[PDB]
Design an enzyme around this catalytic site. Structure first.
Site, PDB file in Angstrom:
ATOM      1  N   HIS A  40       0.828  -1.196   0.000  1.00  0.00           N
ATOM      2  CA  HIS A  40       0.000   0.000   0.000  1.00  0.00           C
ATOM      3  C   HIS A  40       0.871   1.258   0.000  1.00  0.00           C
ATOM      4  CE1 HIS A  40       0.286   0.487   4.504  1.00  0.00           C
ATOM      5  NE2 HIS A  40       0.238   1.732   4.123  1.00  0.00           N
ATOM      6  N   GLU A  52      19.325   7.044   7.711  1.00  0.00           N
ATOM      7  CA  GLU A  52      18.602   8.236   8.138  1.00  0.00           C
ATOM      8  C   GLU A  52      18.323   8.223   9.643  1.00  0.00           C
ATOM      9  OE1 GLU A  52      18.204  10.970   6.953  1.00  0.00           O
ATOM     10  OE2 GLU A  52      17.355  11.075   4.927  1.00  0.00           O
ATOM     11  N   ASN A  54      17.511  12.146  11.429  1.00  0.00           N
ATOM     12  CA  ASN A  54      16.739  13.326  11.070  1.00  0.00           C
ATOM     13  C   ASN A  54      16.547  13.328   9.551  1.00  0.00           C
ATOM     14  OD1 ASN A  54      15.692  16.019  10.562  1.00  0.00           O
ATOM     15  ND2 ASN A  54      16.407  16.554  12.603  1.00  0.00           N
ATOM     16  N   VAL A  57      17.428  16.723   7.752  1.00  0.00           N
ATOM     17  CA  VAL A  57      18.781  17.238   7.829  1.00  0.00           C
ATOM     18  C   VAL A  57      19.719  16.163   7.295  1.00  0.00           C
ATOM     19  CG1 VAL A  57      20.607  18.132   9.384  1.00  0.00           C
ATOM     20  CG2 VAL A  57      18.189  18.597   9.906  1.00  0.00           C
ATOM     21  N   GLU A  62      23.867   9.185   5.453  1.00  0.00           N
ATOM     22  CA  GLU A  62      22.827   8.867   4.495  1.00  0.00           C
ATOM     23  C   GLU A  62      23.445   8.205   3.270  1.00  0.00           C
ATOM     24  OE1 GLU A  62      23.285  11.943   5.599  1.00  0.00           O
ATOM     25  OE2 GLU A  62      21.490  12.352   6.826  1.00  0.00           O
ATOM     26  N   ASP A  84      -0.143  -7.358   2.201  1.00  0.00           N
ATOM     27  CA  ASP A  84       0.376  -6.000   2.142  1.00  0.00           C
ATOM     28  C   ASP A  84       1.902  -6.046   2.263  1.00  0.00           C
ATOM     29  OD1 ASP A  84       0.481  -3.190   1.990  1.00  0.00           O
ATOM     30  OD2 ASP A  84      -0.107  -2.890   4.061  1.00  0.00           O
ATOM     31  N   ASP A 171       1.286   2.803  19.851  1.00  0.00           N
ATOM     32  CA  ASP A 171       0.972   2.186  18.575  1.00  0.00           C
ATOM     33  C   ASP A 171       1.842   2.793  17.484  1.00  0.00           C
ATOM     34  OD1 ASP A 171      -0.537   0.399  16.905  1.00  0.00           O
ATOM     35  OD2 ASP A 171      -2.306   1.683  16.893  1.00  0.00           O
ATOM     36  N   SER A 172       1.923   2.107  16.347  1.00  0.00           N
ATOM     37  CA  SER A 172       2.352   2.758  15.124  1.00  0.00           C
ATOM     38  C   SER A 172       1.246   3.704  14.636  1.00  0.00           C
ATOM     39  CB  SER A 172       2.720   1.736  14.096  1.00  0.00           C
ATOM     40  OG  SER A 172       1.635   0.866  13.812  1.00  0.00           O
ATOM     41  N   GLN A 174       0.147   6.883  11.133  1.00  0.00           N
ATOM     42  CA  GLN A 174       0.373   7.455   9.775  1.00  0.00           C
ATOM     43  C   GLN A 174       1.845   7.877   9.540  1.00  0.00           C
ATOM     44  OE1 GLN A 174      -2.895   8.113  11.166  1.00  0.00           O
ATOM     45  NE2 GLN A 174      -2.515   9.875  12.498  1.00  0.00           N
ATOM     46  N   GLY A 175       2.489   7.315   8.511  1.00  0.00           N
ATOM     47  CA  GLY A 175       3.899   7.589   8.194  1.00  0.00           C
ATOM     48  C   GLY A 175       4.801   6.442   8.588  1.00  0.00           C
ATOM     49  N   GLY A 178       4.764   0.432   6.065  1.00  0.00           N
ATOM     50  CA  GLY A 178       5.853  -0.242   5.329  1.00  0.00           C
ATOM     51  C   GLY A 178       7.095  -0.458   6.157  1.00  0.00           C
TER      52      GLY A 178
END
Ligand SMILES: Cc1ncc(CO)c(CO)c1O
Ligand SMILES: [Ca+2]
Ligand SMILES: [Cl-]
Ligand SMILES: [Cl-]
Length: 223
Positions: A40, A52, A54, A57, A62, A84, A171-172, A174-175, A178
């Site tokens: 999804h 990653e 931040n 920044v 990275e 999913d 909980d987990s 939005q964002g 995955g």
């Protein structure tokens, strides 16, 4: 993550940010060329960001690598969120190191009771909205299949497990979609969905990665 903690820079070297101009989903590095995420989370023109903390920044660990190829599970149902799961090939191999590292796949499924680390850049508030720049962590147990089905009647397939607290608060969110659910050094879950965030009797729902190992291995071997 709601009611979690700041993980610490690079303490979760397998966490990736899926970036399309902006972090929109989590992912998990499973070897130098592949990421596992949620189906999804599919979209085109993804850049995988590894190393990653931040996300707003450049802090020096990275690696930014464009996805060459995405593969949603053959049987992904976007309506029920069954199967999913999705694999993303990197256009070049990641330079694997202490802060950028693959997480092992399960050899077996994990049980109810197992403690797990869920992580992601998702919203940190159960009501209202606040997005953290640095990676957030949550230690949460897998919940029984019976309590998961009871929390979410007619929605929990054999390809999903609940993890979290029935009392809510943690909980987990939005964002985090995955992103990794890691239990005893093994990727057991992918952040799939939930009814809101941290609501009582409404824990997060995770893709059961152990059901998918064969497909992951076979797929990475031919792509
Ligand atoms: C609990 C919960 N609710 C909603 C969403 C939206 O993807 C996610 C993941 O993005 C989530 O984990
Ligand atoms: Ca950064
Ligand atoms: Cl059960
Ligand atoms: Cl049922």
């Amino acid at each position: 993550i709601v009611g979690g903690y700041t993980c610490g820079a690079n303490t979760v070297p397998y966490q990736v940010s899926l970036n399309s101009g902006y972090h929109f989903c989590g992912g998990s590095l499973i070897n130098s060329q592949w990421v596992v995420s949620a189906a999804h989370c599919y979209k085109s023109g993804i850049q995988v960001r590894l190393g990653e903390d931040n996300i707003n920044v450049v802090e020096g660990n990275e690696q930014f690598i464009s996805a060459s190829k995405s593969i949603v599970h053959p049987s992904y149902n976007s309506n029920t969120l069954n199967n999913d799961i999705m694999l993303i090939k990197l256009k070049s191999a990641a330079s694997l190191n202490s802060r950028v590292a693959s997480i092992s796949l399960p050899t077996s499924c994990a049980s109810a009771g197992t403690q797990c680390l869920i992580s992601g850049w998702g919203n940190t508030k159960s009501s209202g909205t606040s997005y953290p720049d640095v990676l957030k962590c949550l230690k949460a147990p897998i919940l029984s299949d019976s309590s998961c089905k009871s929390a979410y009647p007619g929605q929990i397939t054999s390809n999903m497990f609940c993890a979290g607290y029935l009392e809510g608060g943690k909980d987990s969110c939005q964002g985090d979609s995955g992103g990794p659910v890691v239990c005893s050094g093994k990727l057991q879950g992918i952040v799939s969905w939930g009814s809101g965030c941290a609501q009582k009797n409404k824990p997060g729902v995770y893709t059961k990665v152990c059901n998918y190992v064969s497909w992951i291995k076979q797929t990475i071997a031919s792509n």
